[PDB]
Amino acid sequence: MKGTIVGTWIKTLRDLYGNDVVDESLKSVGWEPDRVITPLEDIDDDEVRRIFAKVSEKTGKNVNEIWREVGRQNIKTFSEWFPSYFAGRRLVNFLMMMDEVGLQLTKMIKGATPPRLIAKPVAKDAIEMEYVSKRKMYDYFLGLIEGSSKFFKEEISVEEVERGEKDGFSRLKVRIKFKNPVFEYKKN
Ligand code: HEM
């Protein structure tokens, strides 16, 4: 992972489980607890895995459970560090623009690999969004969706439709229903 995202994870882990659980976790992987991560730096995904695994051991929660909680809370963290992606927007627009944001990011940041989040309208009040990655972070993805709903204070229901791996790609498709109509039919 690029250092920007990893940095938000550390902060979010602290906010959720406290400095002690986090200090010992970073130490367990030979990191300095107060490590400063630079935005463009690359962090070994395996070291992250080991950190979250230690968090799991210390807190008693399973790793999946932790990733779901981090997903929910990290939206707040990210919104603090990068408000321009949230400013003046509403949930539906935020969710539908995110795939392009990732593709743009990939081009502007060497080595960055944000997952695909292709979204499409399926009803006047609903979209489908498919997470496609090399990384299988299913619970984090689901958590981020829930976190977005809280941040924007717009209630939604999320229904998982597909999950599975193929050709080394993890895929997870959800149907997200909004309270009010967000789409209308227009001539093509
Ligand atoms: C402010 C909006 C967002 C920005 C700027 C952003 C950007 C990024 C970046 C830079 C990464 C790191 C990729 C890497 O280090 O190689 C990442 C990872 C990720 N992004 Fe976002 N993202 C945003 C919102 C979202 C949302 C709303 C979702 C889901 C609904 C999402 C899903 C994910 C997931 C699940 C990962 C983990 C990597 C993986 O699973 O493959 N992101 N994103």
Short mmCIF file of N, CA and C in Angstrom, two decimals, residues 7-166:
data_model
loop_
_atom_site.label_atom_id
_atom_site.label_comp_id
_atom_site.label_asym_id
_atom_site.label_seq_id
_atom_site.Cartn_x
_atom_site.Cartn_y
_atom_site.Cartn_z
N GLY A 7 -1.18 5.32 6.58
CA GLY A 7 -1.15 6.31 7.63
C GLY A 7 -2.51 6.51 8.28
N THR A 8 -3.56 6.52 7.46
CA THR A 8 -4.91 6.65 7.98
C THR A 8 -5.30 5.42 8.79
N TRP A 9 -4.84 4.25 8.37
CA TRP A 9 -5.15 3.01 9.09
C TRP A 9 -4.59 3.03 10.52
N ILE A 10 -3.36 3.52 10.67
CA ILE A 10 -2.73 3.58 11.99
C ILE A 10 -3.53 4.49 12.92
N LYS A 11 -3.83 5.69 12.44
CA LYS A 11 -4.62 6.65 13.20
C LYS A 11 -5.98 6.06 13.57
N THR A 12 -6.63 5.42 12.61
CA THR A 12 -7.94 4.81 12.84
C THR A 12 -7.86 3.67 13.86
N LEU A 13 -6.81 2.86 13.77
CA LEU A 13 -6.60 1.78 14.74
C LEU A 13 -6.43 2.32 16.16
N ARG A 14 -5.73 3.45 16.28
CA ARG A 14 -5.53 4.08 17.58
C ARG A 14 -6.85 4.58 18.15
N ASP A 15 -7.63 5.23 17.29
CA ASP A 15 -8.91 5.80 17.71
C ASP A 15 -9.87 4.70 18.15
N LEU A 16 -9.71 3.51 17.59
CA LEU A 16 -10.62 2.39 17.88
C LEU A 16 -10.16 1.53 19.05
N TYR A 17 -8.86 1.24 19.11
CA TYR A 17 -8.36 0.23 20.04
C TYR A 17 -7.29 0.74 21.00
N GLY A 18 -6.91 2.01 20.87
CA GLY A 18 -5.98 2.62 21.81
C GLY A 18 -4.52 2.51 21.44
N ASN A 19 -3.71 3.43 21.97
CA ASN A 19 -2.29 3.52 21.64
C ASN A 19 -1.47 2.29 22.01
N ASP A 20 -1.85 1.62 23.09
CA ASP A 20 -1.10 0.46 23.58
C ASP A 20 -1.17 -0.71 22.61
N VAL A 21 -2.39 -1.07 22.20
CA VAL A 21 -2.60 -2.13 21.23
C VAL A 21 -1.84 -1.85 19.94
N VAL A 22 -1.76 -0.58 19.57
CA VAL A 22 -1.15 -0.17 18.30
C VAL A 22 0.38 -0.12 18.37
N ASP A 23 0.91 0.41 19.47
CA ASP A 23 2.35 0.48 19.66
C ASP A 23 2.99 -0.90 19.62
N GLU A 24 2.40 -1.84 20.34
CA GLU A 24 2.92 -3.20 20.41
C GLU A 24 2.78 -3.93 19.08
N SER A 25 1.74 -3.58 18.33
CA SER A 25 1.50 -4.18 17.03
C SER A 25 2.56 -3.74 16.03
N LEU A 26 2.84 -2.45 15.99
CA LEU A 26 3.88 -1.94 15.10
C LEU A 26 5.24 -2.52 15.49
N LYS A 27 5.50 -2.59 16.79
CA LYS A 27 6.75 -3.17 17.29
C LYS A 27 6.89 -4.63 16.86
N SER A 28 5.79 -5.37 16.90
CA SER A 28 5.81 -6.78 16.54
C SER A 28 6.33 -6.99 15.11
N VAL A 29 6.28 -5.94 14.30
CA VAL A 29 6.79 -6.02 12.93
C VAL A 29 8.02 -5.15 12.74
N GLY A 30 8.71 -4.85 13.83
CA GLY A 30 9.94 -4.09 13.76
C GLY A 30 9.75 -2.67 13.27
N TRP A 31 8.53 -2.17 13.37
CA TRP A 31 8.25 -0.77 13.07
C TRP A 31 8.48 0.04 14.33
N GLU A 32 8.86 1.30 14.16
CA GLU A 32 8.85 2.26 15.24
C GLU A 32 7.42 2.71 15.50
N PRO A 33 6.96 2.66 16.74
CA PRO A 33 5.58 2.99 17.04
C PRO A 33 5.18 4.36 16.59
N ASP A 34 6.13 5.22 16.37
CA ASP A 34 5.76 6.55 16.09
C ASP A 34 6.17 6.80 14.68
N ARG A 35 6.43 5.72 13.98
CA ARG A 35 6.81 5.80 12.58
C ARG A 35 6.04 6.88 11.85
N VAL A 36 6.76 7.71 11.12
CA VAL A 36 6.15 8.67 10.21
C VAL A 36 6.11 8.10 8.79
N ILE A 37 4.91 7.97 8.25
CA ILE A 37 4.74 7.48 6.89
C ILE A 37 4.58 8.65 5.94
N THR A 38 5.40 8.70 4.90
CA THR A 38 5.27 9.74 3.88
C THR A 38 4.25 9.30 2.83
N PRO A 39 3.49 10.26 2.28
CA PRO A 39 2.38 9.96 1.37
C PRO A 39 2.77 9.01 0.23
N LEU A 40 3.89 9.28 -0.42
CA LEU A 40 4.27 8.56 -1.63
C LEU A 40 5.07 7.28 -1.37
N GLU A 41 5.40 7.03 -0.10
CA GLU A 41 6.14 5.83 0.28
C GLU A 41 5.32 4.55 0.05
N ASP A 42 5.99 3.45 -0.26
CA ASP A 42 5.31 2.16 -0.40
C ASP A 42 5.52 1.28 0.81
N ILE A 43 4.41 0.78 1.37
CA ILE A 43 4.45 -0.08 2.54
C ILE A 43 4.11 -1.52 2.17
N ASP A 44 4.91 -2.46 2.68
CA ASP A 44 4.72 -3.87 2.40
C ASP A 44 3.37 -4.37 2.92
N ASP A 45 2.52 -4.84 2.01
CA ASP A 45 1.20 -5.35 2.38
C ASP A 45 1.28 -6.44 3.45
N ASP A 46 2.34 -7.24 3.41
CA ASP A 46 2.50 -8.32 4.39
C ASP A 46 2.72 -7.80 5.81
N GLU A 47 3.44 -6.69 5.93
CA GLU A 47 3.64 -6.07 7.24
C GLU A 47 2.32 -5.55 7.79
N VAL A 48 1.47 -5.02 6.91
CA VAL A 48 0.14 -4.57 7.31
C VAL A 48 -0.65 -5.76 7.85
N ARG A 49 -0.65 -6.85 7.09
CA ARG A 49 -1.36 -8.05 7.47
C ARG A 49 -0.94 -8.47 8.87
N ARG A 50 0.36 -8.47 9.12
CA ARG A 50 0.87 -8.91 10.41
C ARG A 50 0.48 -7.94 11.53
N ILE A 51 0.43 -6.65 11.21
CA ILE A 51 -0.03 -5.67 12.19
C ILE A 51 -1.49 -5.90 12.59
N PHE A 52 -2.35 -6.07 11.59
CA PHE A 52 -3.77 -6.30 11.86
C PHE A 52 -3.98 -7.63 12.58
N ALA A 53 -3.14 -8.61 12.29
CA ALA A 53 -3.24 -9.91 12.95
C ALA A 53 -2.91 -9.80 14.44
N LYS A 54 -1.95 -8.94 14.77
CA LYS A 54 -1.58 -8.71 16.16
C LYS A 54 -2.68 -7.92 16.87
N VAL A 55 -3.25 -6.94 16.18
CA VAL A 55 -4.40 -6.21 16.71
C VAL A 55 -5.48 -7.20 17.07
N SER A 56 -5.67 -8.18 16.20
CA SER A 56 -6.69 -9.19 16.40
C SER A 56 -6.40 -9.99 17.66
N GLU A 57 -5.15 -10.43 17.80
CA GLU A 57 -4.74 -11.20 18.97
C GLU A 57 -4.96 -10.42 20.26
N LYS A 58 -4.59 -9.14 20.25
CA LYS A 58 -4.67 -8.32 21.45
C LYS A 58 -6.08 -7.89 21.83
N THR A 59 -6.95 -7.71 20.84
CA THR A 59 -8.30 -7.21 21.10
C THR A 59 -9.33 -8.32 21.25
N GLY A 60 -9.05 -9.48 20.68
CA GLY A 60 -9.97 -10.60 20.75
C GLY A 60 -10.95 -10.65 19.59
N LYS A 61 -10.94 -9.61 18.75
CA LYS A 61 -11.80 -9.58 17.57
C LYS A 61 -11.12 -10.30 16.41
N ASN A 62 -11.89 -10.94 15.55
CA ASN A 62 -11.28 -11.57 14.38
C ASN A 62 -10.89 -10.51 13.34
N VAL A 63 -9.93 -10.86 12.48
CA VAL A 63 -9.41 -9.93 11.49
C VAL A 63 -10.50 -9.32 10.61
N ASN A 64 -11.44 -10.15 10.15
CA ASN A 64 -12.55 -9.66 9.34
C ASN A 64 -13.35 -8.59 10.07
N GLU A 65 -13.67 -8.89 11.32
CA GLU A 65 -14.36 -7.97 12.21
C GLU A 65 -13.61 -6.65 12.33
N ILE A 66 -12.29 -6.74 12.45
CA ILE A 66 -11.47 -5.54 12.59
C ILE A 66 -11.51 -4.70 11.31
N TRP A 67 -11.40 -5.36 10.16
CA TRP A 67 -11.41 -4.64 8.89
C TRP A 67 -12.74 -3.94 8.64
N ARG A 68 -13.83 -4.53 9.12
CA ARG A 68 -15.13 -3.93 8.99
C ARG A 68 -15.25 -2.68 9.84
N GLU A 69 -14.72 -2.75 11.06
CA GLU A 69 -14.75 -1.61 11.97
C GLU A 69 -13.83 -0.50 11.47
N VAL A 70 -12.69 -0.89 10.90
CA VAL A 70 -11.74 0.10 10.38
C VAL A 70 -12.35 0.79 9.18
N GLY A 71 -12.99 0.02 8.31
CA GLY A 71 -13.69 0.59 7.17
C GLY A 71 -14.67 1.68 7.55
N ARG A 72 -15.49 1.41 8.57
CA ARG A 72 -16.49 2.37 9.02
C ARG A 72 -15.85 3.65 9.54
N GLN A 73 -14.85 3.50 10.40
CA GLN A 73 -14.20 4.64 11.03
C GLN A 73 -13.25 5.39 10.09
N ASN A 74 -12.63 4.68 9.16
CA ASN A 74 -11.61 5.31 8.32
C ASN A 74 -12.15 6.38 7.39
N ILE A 75 -13.44 6.29 7.05
CA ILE A 75 -14.07 7.34 6.25
C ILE A 75 -13.94 8.67 6.98
N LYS A 76 -14.16 8.67 8.29
CA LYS A 76 -13.98 9.89 9.07
C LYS A 76 -12.53 10.37 9.01
N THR A 77 -11.60 9.46 9.28
CA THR A 77 -10.19 9.81 9.24
C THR A 77 -9.83 10.43 7.90
N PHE A 78 -10.20 9.74 6.82
CA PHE A 78 -9.85 10.19 5.48
C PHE A 78 -10.48 11.55 5.19
N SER A 79 -11.72 11.73 5.66
CA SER A 79 -12.44 12.98 5.43
C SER A 79 -11.75 14.14 6.14
N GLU A 80 -11.07 13.84 7.24
CA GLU A 80 -10.31 14.86 7.95
C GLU A 80 -9.05 15.23 7.17
N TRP A 81 -8.37 14.22 6.64
CA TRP A 81 -7.11 14.41 5.93
C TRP A 81 -7.28 14.88 4.48
N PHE A 82 -8.41 14.56 3.86
CA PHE A 82 -8.64 14.90 2.46
C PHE A 82 -10.07 15.37 2.18
N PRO A 83 -10.46 16.51 2.78
CA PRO A 83 -11.84 17.00 2.75
C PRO A 83 -12.37 17.32 1.36
N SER A 84 -11.49 17.51 0.38
CA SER A 84 -11.94 17.94 -0.94
C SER A 84 -12.74 16.87 -1.68
N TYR A 85 -12.58 15.61 -1.29
CA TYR A 85 -13.34 14.54 -1.91
C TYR A 85 -14.75 14.44 -1.35
N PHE A 86 -15.00 15.12 -0.24
CA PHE A 86 -16.29 15.06 0.43
C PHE A 86 -17.06 16.38 0.37
N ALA A 87 -16.31 17.48 0.32
CA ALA A 87 -16.89 18.82 0.37
C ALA A 87 -18.01 19.04 -0.63
N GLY A 88 -19.16 19.48 -0.13
CA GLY A 88 -20.28 19.88 -0.96
C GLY A 88 -20.91 18.79 -1.80
N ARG A 89 -20.59 17.53 -1.50
CA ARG A 89 -21.12 16.42 -2.28
C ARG A 89 -22.20 15.68 -1.53
N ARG A 90 -22.94 14.84 -2.26
CA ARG A 90 -23.89 13.94 -1.63
C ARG A 90 -23.58 12.49 -1.95
N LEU A 91 -24.10 11.59 -1.12
CA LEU A 91 -23.70 10.19 -1.14
C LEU A 91 -23.69 9.58 -2.54
N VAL A 92 -24.81 9.67 -3.24
CA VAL A 92 -24.92 9.00 -4.53
C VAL A 92 -23.82 9.44 -5.50
N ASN A 93 -23.59 10.75 -5.60
CA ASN A 93 -22.56 11.27 -6.48
C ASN A 93 -21.18 10.81 -6.02
N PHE A 94 -20.98 10.83 -4.71
CA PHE A 94 -19.72 10.39 -4.11
C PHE A 94 -19.40 8.95 -4.50
N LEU A 95 -20.39 8.07 -4.36
CA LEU A 95 -20.19 6.66 -4.65
C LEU A 95 -19.95 6.40 -6.13
N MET A 96 -20.69 7.09 -6.99
CA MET A 96 -20.61 6.83 -8.42
C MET A 96 -19.36 7.40 -9.07
N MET A 97 -18.78 8.42 -8.46
CA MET A 97 -17.59 9.03 -9.03
C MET A 97 -16.32 8.29 -8.63
N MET A 98 -16.42 7.42 -7.63
CA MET A 98 -15.23 6.87 -6.98
C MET A 98 -14.37 5.98 -7.89
N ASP A 99 -14.98 5.31 -8.86
CA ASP A 99 -14.19 4.47 -9.75
C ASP A 99 -13.25 5.32 -10.60
N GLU A 100 -13.74 6.46 -11.06
CA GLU A 100 -12.94 7.35 -11.89
C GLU A 100 -11.84 8.00 -11.05
N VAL A 101 -12.17 8.35 -9.81
CA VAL A 101 -11.18 8.87 -8.88
C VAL A 101 -9.99 7.93 -8.76
N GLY A 102 -10.27 6.63 -8.66
CA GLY A 102 -9.22 5.64 -8.55
C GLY A 102 -8.38 5.54 -9.80
N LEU A 103 -9.03 5.53 -10.95
CA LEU A 103 -8.30 5.46 -12.22
C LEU A 103 -7.40 6.68 -12.40
N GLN A 104 -7.92 7.86 -12.05
CA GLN A 104 -7.16 9.10 -12.08
C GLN A 104 -5.96 9.03 -11.13
N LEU A 105 -6.22 8.59 -9.90
CA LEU A 105 -5.18 8.37 -8.90
C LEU A 105 -4.06 7.48 -9.42
N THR A 106 -4.44 6.37 -10.04
CA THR A 106 -3.46 5.42 -10.56
C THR A 106 -2.50 6.11 -11.52
N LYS A 107 -3.04 7.01 -12.35
CA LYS A 107 -2.23 7.70 -13.34
C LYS A 107 -1.31 8.74 -12.72
N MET A 108 -1.78 9.42 -11.68
CA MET A 108 -1.01 10.49 -11.05
C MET A 108 -0.06 10.01 -9.96
N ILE A 109 -0.29 8.82 -9.42
CA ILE A 109 0.58 8.30 -8.38
C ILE A 109 1.21 6.98 -8.80
N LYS A 110 2.51 7.02 -9.08
CA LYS A 110 3.26 5.83 -9.45
C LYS A 110 3.12 4.74 -8.39
N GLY A 111 2.71 3.54 -8.81
CA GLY A 111 2.64 2.40 -7.92
C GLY A 111 1.31 2.22 -7.20
N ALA A 112 0.45 3.22 -7.28
CA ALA A 112 -0.86 3.15 -6.62
C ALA A 112 -1.80 2.17 -7.32
N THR A 113 -2.49 1.34 -6.56
CA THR A 113 -3.45 0.42 -7.16
C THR A 113 -4.78 0.35 -6.41
N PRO A 114 -5.52 1.47 -6.39
CA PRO A 114 -6.88 1.50 -5.82
C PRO A 114 -7.76 0.52 -6.59
N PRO A 115 -8.65 -0.19 -5.88
CA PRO A 115 -9.52 -1.17 -6.55
C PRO A 115 -10.49 -0.49 -7.51
N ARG A 116 -11.00 -1.25 -8.47
CA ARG A 116 -12.11 -0.79 -9.29
C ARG A 116 -13.38 -0.81 -8.44
N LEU A 117 -14.22 0.20 -8.60
CA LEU A 117 -15.49 0.30 -7.89
C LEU A 117 -16.61 0.67 -8.86
N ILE A 118 -16.67 -0.03 -9.98
CA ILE A 118 -17.66 0.28 -11.02
C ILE A 118 -19.06 0.28 -10.43
N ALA A 119 -19.78 1.37 -10.62
CA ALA A 119 -21.14 1.47 -10.12
C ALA A 119 -22.12 1.74 -11.25
N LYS A 120 -23.31 1.16 -11.17
CA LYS A 120 -24.35 1.52 -12.13
C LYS A 120 -25.76 1.51 -11.56
N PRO A 121 -26.60 2.44 -12.05
CA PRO A 121 -28.01 2.52 -11.64
C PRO A 121 -28.74 1.25 -12.04
N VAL A 122 -29.53 0.69 -11.13
CA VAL A 122 -30.35 -0.47 -11.46
C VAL A 122 -31.83 -0.18 -11.22
N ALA A 123 -32.09 0.90 -10.50
CA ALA A 123 -33.45 1.34 -10.20
C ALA A 123 -33.39 2.84 -9.95
N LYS A 124 -34.55 3.48 -9.86
CA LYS A 124 -34.56 4.92 -9.65
C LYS A 124 -33.93 5.24 -8.30
N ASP A 125 -33.93 4.26 -7.40
CA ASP A 125 -33.40 4.47 -6.06
C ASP A 125 -32.31 3.48 -5.70
N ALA A 126 -31.58 2.98 -6.69
CA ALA A 126 -30.59 1.94 -6.41
C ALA A 126 -29.47 1.82 -7.44
N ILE A 127 -28.28 1.48 -6.95
CA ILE A 127 -27.15 1.18 -7.81
C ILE A 127 -26.56 -0.17 -7.44
N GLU A 128 -25.82 -0.75 -8.38
CA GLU A 128 -24.92 -1.85 -8.06
C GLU A 128 -23.48 -1.34 -8.11
N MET A 129 -22.67 -1.77 -7.15
CA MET A 129 -21.26 -1.44 -7.17
C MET A 129 -20.45 -2.71 -7.00
N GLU A 130 -19.43 -2.88 -7.84
CA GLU A 130 -18.58 -4.06 -7.76
C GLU A 130 -17.15 -3.71 -7.42
N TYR A 131 -16.72 -4.18 -6.26
CA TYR A 131 -15.32 -4.14 -5.85
C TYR A 131 -14.55 -5.18 -6.65
N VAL A 132 -13.50 -4.74 -7.34
CA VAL A 132 -12.61 -5.65 -8.06
C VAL A 132 -11.16 -5.32 -7.73
N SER A 133 -10.45 -6.29 -7.18
CA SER A 133 -9.11 -6.05 -6.68
C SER A 133 -8.23 -7.27 -6.80
N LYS A 134 -6.94 -7.06 -6.57
CA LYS A 134 -6.00 -8.16 -6.43
C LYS A 134 -5.83 -8.50 -4.95
N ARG A 135 -6.48 -7.72 -4.09
CA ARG A 135 -6.19 -7.74 -2.65
C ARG A 135 -7.21 -8.38 -1.70
N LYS A 136 -8.41 -8.68 -2.18
CA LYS A 136 -9.44 -9.26 -1.31
C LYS A 136 -9.58 -8.58 0.07
N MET A 137 -10.05 -7.33 0.08
CA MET A 137 -10.35 -6.65 1.33
C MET A 137 -11.85 -6.43 1.46
N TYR A 138 -12.59 -7.55 1.46
CA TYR A 138 -14.05 -7.54 1.42
C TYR A 138 -14.71 -6.75 2.55
N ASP A 139 -14.31 -7.04 3.79
CA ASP A 139 -14.90 -6.38 4.95
C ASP A 139 -14.59 -4.88 5.03
N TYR A 140 -13.38 -4.51 4.61
CA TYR A 140 -12.99 -3.11 4.56
C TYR A 140 -13.88 -2.37 3.57
N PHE A 141 -14.02 -2.93 2.37
CA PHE A 141 -14.91 -2.36 1.35
C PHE A 141 -16.31 -2.13 1.91
N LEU A 142 -16.89 -3.15 2.51
CA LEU A 142 -18.24 -3.04 3.06
C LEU A 142 -18.30 -1.98 4.15
N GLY A 143 -17.26 -1.93 4.97
CA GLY A 143 -17.17 -0.96 6.05
C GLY A 143 -17.12 0.47 5.54
N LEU A 144 -16.31 0.69 4.50
CA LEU A 144 -16.19 2.02 3.90
C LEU A 144 -17.54 2.53 3.39
N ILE A 145 -18.31 1.64 2.77
CA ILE A 145 -19.66 1.98 2.32
C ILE A 145 -20.53 2.46 3.48
N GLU A 146 -20.51 1.71 4.58
CA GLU A 146 -21.29 2.08 5.76
C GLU A 146 -20.80 3.40 6.35
N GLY A 147 -19.48 3.58 6.35
CA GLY A 147 -18.88 4.81 6.86
C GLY A 147 -19.26 6.02 6.03
N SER A 148 -19.38 5.83 4.73
CA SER A 148 -19.78 6.91 3.83
C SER A 148 -21.21 7.34 4.13
N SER A 149 -22.07 6.36 4.37
CA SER A 149 -23.46 6.63 4.70
C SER A 149 -23.58 7.45 5.98
N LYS A 150 -22.77 7.11 6.98
CA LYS A 150 -22.77 7.89 8.21
C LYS A 150 -22.22 9.30 7.98
N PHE A 151 -21.08 9.40 7.30
CA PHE A 151 -20.50 10.72 7.05
C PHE A 151 -21.49 11.66 6.37
N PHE A 152 -22.15 11.17 5.33
CA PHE A 152 -23.07 11.99 4.55
C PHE A 152 -24.46 12.06 5.18
N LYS A 153 -24.64 11.32 6.27
CA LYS A 153 -25.94 11.25 6.94
C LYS A 153 -27.07 10.99 5.96
N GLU A 154 -26.89 9.99 5.11
CA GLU A 154 -27.93 9.54 4.21
C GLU A 154 -28.08 8.03 4.35
N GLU A 155 -29.22 7.60 4.89
CA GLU A 155 -29.45 6.20 5.20
C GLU A 155 -29.53 5.36 3.93
N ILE A 156 -28.95 4.17 3.97
CA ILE A 156 -29.01 3.25 2.84
C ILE A 156 -29.16 1.82 3.34
N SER A 157 -29.62 0.93 2.46
CA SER A 157 -29.54 -0.49 2.75
C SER A 157 -28.56 -1.11 1.75
N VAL A 158 -27.72 -2.02 2.24
CA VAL A 158 -26.72 -2.66 1.40
C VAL A 158 -26.93 -4.16 1.37
N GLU A 159 -27.07 -4.70 0.17
CA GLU A 159 -27.31 -6.12 -0.01
C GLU A 159 -26.18 -6.72 -0.85
N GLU A 160 -25.48 -7.70 -0.31
CA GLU A 160 -24.41 -8.35 -1.06
C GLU A 160 -24.98 -9.35 -2.05
N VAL A 161 -24.54 -9.26 -3.30
CA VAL A 161 -25.12 -10.05 -4.38
C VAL A 161 -24.16 -11.13 -4.85
N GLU A 162 -22.88 -10.78 -4.96
CA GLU A 162 -21.86 -11.74 -5.38
C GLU A 162 -20.56 -11.54 -4.62
N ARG A 163 -19.86 -12.64 -4.36
CA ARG A 163 -18.52 -12.63 -3.80
C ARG A 163 -17.76 -13.84 -4.34
N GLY A 164 -16.50 -13.64 -4.71
CA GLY A 164 -15.68 -14.72 -5.23
C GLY A 164 -14.41 -14.24 -5.89
N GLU A 165 -13.47 -15.17 -6.09
CA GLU A 165 -12.20 -14.88 -6.74
C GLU A 165 -12.08 -15.63 -8.06
N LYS A 166 -11.52 -14.97 -9.08
CA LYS A 166 -11.30 -15.62 -10.36
C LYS A 166 -10.23 -14.91 -11.18
#
